[PDB]
Motif scaffolding. Structure first.
Motif, short mmCIF file in Angstrom:
data_model
loop_
_atom_site.label_atom_id
_atom_site.label_comp_id
_atom_site.label_asym_id
_atom_site.label_seq_id
_atom_site.Cartn_x
_atom_site.Cartn_y
_atom_site.Cartn_z
N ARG A 1 52.87 21.23 58.72
CA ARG A 1 51.47 21.72 58.55
C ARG A 1 51.44 22.90 57.58
O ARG A 1 50.55 22.92 56.70
CB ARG A 1 50.84 22.09 59.90
CG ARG A 1 50.47 20.89 60.76
CD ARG A 1 49.71 21.27 62.02
NE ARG A 1 49.10 20.10 62.63
CZ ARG A 1 49.62 19.38 63.63
NH1 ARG A 1 50.78 19.71 64.17
NH2 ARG A 1 48.97 18.33 64.08
N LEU B 1 43.75 14.50 55.42
CA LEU B 1 44.51 14.95 56.60
C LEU B 1 43.55 15.54 57.64
O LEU B 1 42.80 16.47 57.27
CB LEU B 1 45.54 15.99 56.15
CG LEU B 1 46.58 16.38 57.20
CD1 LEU B 1 47.60 15.26 57.40
CD2 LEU B 1 47.27 17.67 56.81
N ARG B 2 43.56 15.00 58.86
CA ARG B 2 42.89 15.62 60.04
C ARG B 2 43.56 16.97 60.30
O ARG B 2 44.78 16.98 60.55
CB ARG B 2 42.98 14.69 61.25
CG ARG B 2 42.01 15.02 62.38
CD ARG B 2 41.96 13.93 63.43
NE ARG B 2 41.49 12.66 62.88
CZ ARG B 2 41.61 11.47 63.47
NH1 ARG B 2 42.20 11.35 64.64
NH2 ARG B 2 41.13 10.39 62.86
N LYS B 3 42.81 18.07 60.18
CA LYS B 3 43.28 19.47 60.28
C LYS B 3 42.62 20.15 61.48
O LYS B 3 42.82 19.75 62.64
CB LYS B 3 42.99 20.21 59.00
N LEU C 1 52.15 21.64 53.90
CA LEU C 1 50.94 20.88 53.47
C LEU C 1 49.86 21.85 52.99
O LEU C 1 49.09 21.48 52.09
CB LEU C 1 50.42 20.04 54.64
CG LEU C 1 51.18 18.74 54.89
CD1 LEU C 1 50.86 18.18 56.27
CD2 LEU C 1 50.86 17.73 53.81
N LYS C 2 49.80 23.03 53.59
CA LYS C 2 48.85 24.11 53.22
C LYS C 2 49.36 24.75 51.91
O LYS C 2 48.53 24.87 50.99
CB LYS C 2 48.67 25.08 54.39
CG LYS C 2 47.71 26.25 54.16
CD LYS C 2 48.30 27.58 54.59
CE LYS C 2 47.56 28.78 54.06
NZ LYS C 2 46.65 29.36 55.08
N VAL D 1 41.06 17.57 55.11
CA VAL D 1 41.44 18.21 53.82
C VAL D 1 42.02 17.12 52.90
O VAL D 1 42.84 16.32 53.38
CB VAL D 1 42.41 19.38 54.05
CG1 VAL D 1 43.73 18.94 54.67
CG2 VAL D 1 42.66 20.16 52.77
N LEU E 1 44.34 15.84 49.92
CA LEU E 1 45.67 16.25 49.39
C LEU E 1 46.26 15.12 48.54
O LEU E 1 46.04 13.94 48.86
CB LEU E 1 46.59 16.57 50.56
CG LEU E 1 46.14 17.71 51.47
CD1 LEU E 1 46.99 17.76 52.73
CD2 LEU E 1 46.20 19.04 50.72
C1 LIG Z 1 47.95 21.32 57.32
C2 LIG Z 1 46.24 21.11 57.48
S1 LIG Z 1 45.22 22.65 56.85
C3 LIG Z 1 45.11 22.90 54.96
C4 LIG Z 1 45.94 22.07 54.21
C5 LIG Z 1 45.99 22.12 52.82
C6 LIG Z 1 45.18 23.03 52.14
C7 LIG Z 1 44.35 23.86 52.89
C8 LIG Z 1 44.30 23.81 54.31
C9 LIG Z 1 43.34 24.77 55.07
O1 LIG Z 1 43.49 24.84 56.30
O2 LIG Z 1 42.51 25.40 54.40
C10 LIG Z 1 46.64 19.62 56.93
C11 LIG Z 1 47.63 19.73 58.01
C12 LIG Z 1 46.68 20.64 58.95
#
Ligand SMILES: CC1(Sc2ccccc2C(=O)O)CCC1
Length: 113
Positions: free
Chosen positions: A33, A111-113, A36-37, A4, A6
């Protein structure tokens, strides 16, 4: 998506009203986490004097790879009394709640999600 894009507002350590995400490694990584969302996550750059002014456990973003679209790839690494939970590259800074503090700058990260 596994990654994602950011734009994290970079805050001055002395401006920060809420100086950590919680009381356990598992909680700071979860709250980090979540923020960040919701786009309620800030970044403080780590210098001499900066970490003692912040609450442990820490959550760092560290470089995971050498930068699509200007965005550096990073991953979350918590630290509590000198032990890190995760393994990664150079620290880009420490994550904190953002509650409306004026940034000095923006850090583009993938960011690795
Ligand atoms: C916290 C992620 S997930 C995410 C982050 C920002 C915006 C949207 C999303 C989503 O999952 O759609 C980055 C940390 C794991």
């Amino acid at each position: 998506k596994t990654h994602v894009q950011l734009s994290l507002p970079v805050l001055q350590v002395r401006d920060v009203l809420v100086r950590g995400f919680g009381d356990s490694v598992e909680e700071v990584l979860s709250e980090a986490r979540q923020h960040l969302k919701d786009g309620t996550c800030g970044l403080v750059e780590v210098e001499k004097g900066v970490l003692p002014q912040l609450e442990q456990p820490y959550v760092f973003i560290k470089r995971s790879d050498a930068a699509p679209h200007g965005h550096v790839m990073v991953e979350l690494v918590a630290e509590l009394e000198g032990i890190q939970y995760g393994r990664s590259g150079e620290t880009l800074g420490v994550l904190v709640p953002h509650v409306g503090e004026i940034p000095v700058a923006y850090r583009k990260v993938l960011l690795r999600k």
